[PDB]
Amino acid sequence: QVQLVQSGAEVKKPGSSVKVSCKASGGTFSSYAISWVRQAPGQGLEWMGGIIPIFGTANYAQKFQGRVTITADESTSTAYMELSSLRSEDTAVYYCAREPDYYDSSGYYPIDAFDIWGQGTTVTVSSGGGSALTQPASVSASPGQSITISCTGTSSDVGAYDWVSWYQQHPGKAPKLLIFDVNNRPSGVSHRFSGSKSGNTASLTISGLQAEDEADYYCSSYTRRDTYVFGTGTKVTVLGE
């Protein structure tokens, strides 16, 4: 029953800092990290960094190295992201998400994906006067057929290992994990969704397309540089619906 709830919206001028919190509750499981992922208005997902609360070791995208700090307080089950020296491009919804280890006969194992997401925190930077993974921008299709969405990366992400995932996002909601480890569906995800990859391109197939599948879809991969990257996003429109 694990869930993540984030703090409320912030409005800031350029040059200021913002600190967003993420409170975990509802479970007992402890083998996980927390990542922070942002999304500018009308745009795609961008990974910022993450932390493993049980050690306190944080990792960042190079882009944000030196002006983002991610911390965690185990006593209150809260993670934090502080972004300093704000600028125009920082206007976005900021999400925290769990990066868990699962457990099976192989023992503990990473899914290399984000299964539980916070609801997002809007940060607006006031006006001051002024991708490794690529996807098709859009696909439109009538319901009741199969469609496929592609994700083209490089040898150091999609083409490296099976650490490829897919997310669905409906308007006003956090992304939802549909596929991890190239072709695995989370418990409860429809088996109409399937994943594959060939060389540097991954594919999500949606069979028996339904009206409710109209959404944005993002591929993601871990990388040889110990980071996550996200695709540019594909808008699926279901025709007549």
Our finding on whether 190 is near Cl ion (CB under 5 A) is: yes
- Do 178 and 167 contact (CB within 8 A), yes or no? yes
Closer to Cl ion at the Cβ: 173 or 224? 173
Nearest approach in angstroms of CB 66 to Cl ion is 20
- How large is the C-alpha radius of gyration of the chain? 18
Q: Give whichever of 157 and 214 is closer to Cl ion, judged by the CB atom.
A: 214
207 binds Cl ion per the rule CB under 5 A = no
Distance CA 66, CA 219 (A): 27
Q: Residue 119: which residues within 8 A CB-CB, separation 6 or more? A: 4, 5, 6, 174
**Which residue in the set 12, 23, 67, 235 belongs to the binding site for Cl ion (CB under 5 A)?**
12
Could you report how far apart the first and last alpha carbons of the chain are, in Å?
A: 33
Q: Is residue 14 within 8 Å of residue 88, measured between CB atoms? A: yes
- SS3 (DSSP) at 75: helix
Residue 119 contacts Cl ion per CB under 5 A: yes
Interface with Cl ion includes 19 (CB under 5 A)?
no
Binding segment (CB under 5 A) for Cl ion, from list 17-25, 89-97, 139-147, 170-178? 170-178
Closer to Cl ion at the Cβ: 16 or 232?
16
Question: For binding to Cl ion (CB under 5 A), which residues are involved?
Answer: 12-13, 16, 119, 173-174, 189-190
